[PDB]
Design a protein around this ligand. Sequence first.
Ligand code: UAB
Ligand code: UAB
Lengths: 193, 193
Amino acid sequence: GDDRELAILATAENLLEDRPLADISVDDLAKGAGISRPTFYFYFPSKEAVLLTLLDRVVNQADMALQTLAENPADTDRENMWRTGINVFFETFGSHKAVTRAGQAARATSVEVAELWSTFMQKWIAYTAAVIDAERDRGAAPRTLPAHELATALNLMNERTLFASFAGEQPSVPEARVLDTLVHIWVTSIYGE
Amino acid sequence: GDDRELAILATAENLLEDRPLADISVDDLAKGAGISRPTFYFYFPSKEAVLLTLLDRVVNQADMALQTLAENPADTDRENMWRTGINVFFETFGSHKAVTRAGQAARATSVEVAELWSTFMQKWIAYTAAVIDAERDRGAAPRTLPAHELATALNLMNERTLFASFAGEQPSVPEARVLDTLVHIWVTSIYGE
Ligand SMILES: CC1CCN(C(=O)NCCCCc2ccccc2)CC1
Ligand SMILES: CC1CCN(C(=O)NCCCCc2ccccc2)CC1
């Protein structure tokens, strides 16, 4: 039950490593999950719905990891605090590159996918701005740009930079350099006057 | 001749303000340009080719403005140098929001569009890195990150941040705040230790 659904999701994620969603059929998904095409349609209306569920799982995985981090402070410097946080996104999305790639592409065609990304990006920006605000309140960070606006640009940078690196786009920061690159820009822009 | 082509391009840019390329027909383009559908096909193979040409024009307009700026230094501080430069992109793309929007979407489906963006992003990153390198050589900027890697992330930030602002995406930096936001992050990350 859960098992056929889990199998469909696992098949989909595995096939997306090889080709885009356009080139994967419901027949491909059913076959891989060891069910028939009508049984597939019991669990999902479309292959598009399968992607949506896979992206939902990855975005929530990231969110829950960030929640964990937020509850137990690492006893470290400010640079390290930001690094550990960005690293949640690097490792989570970077562990699901095919879903990340397909999910990004689907924003163009899917209002539900567009709204899922938007919802979580708004949450992550809000959290970012709250931490900047806390750093300012304690006297560690200068009161420069509106914290929410700075947070916004820095999160959008990470979105575009991480995903270019993962996809091997030209241009991109090599994946082995992308965490240091982002952390630098975050720390200098947050603490810099 | 040039005139029918120019009319087709002008019609296309005007219709893209209203609806996406998917919802614009060759018949819509021909009618607007005051030609027949077969005469259209003399000038362009597809509506997709029309977009490609419009994007080519906008990207070259930006590039040529940056070339102009690069030839005649403004007698100003370092913050202002970066601002005037970023402003070329803000004003150029911001003056062609419908083409920018459609052109960004077309990267997913069009190898030629993907390669055009890539070509010019590589040029602009290279120029950025050259200016950072010059600032370091003169002793104004510290030798922190690899200049090309820093340049890369900052250009990708601008791409994603400007285009979210222009499209009124949620989340986005308000368009009236986006230049100050980007300039802050550029100057702090380039000059910060
Ligand atoms: C789909 C996008 C979402 C945005 N991305 C991303 O890296 N955001 C990073 C947010 C870091 C939040 C944080 C602040 C302080 C301490 C710990 C954590 C990139 C991926
Ligand atoms: C499609 C993208 C391309 C990248 N974008 C963008 O703002 N790049 C800014 C490059 C600024 C180069 C410069 C350096 C120093 C002095 C003057 C100029 C955003 C739009």
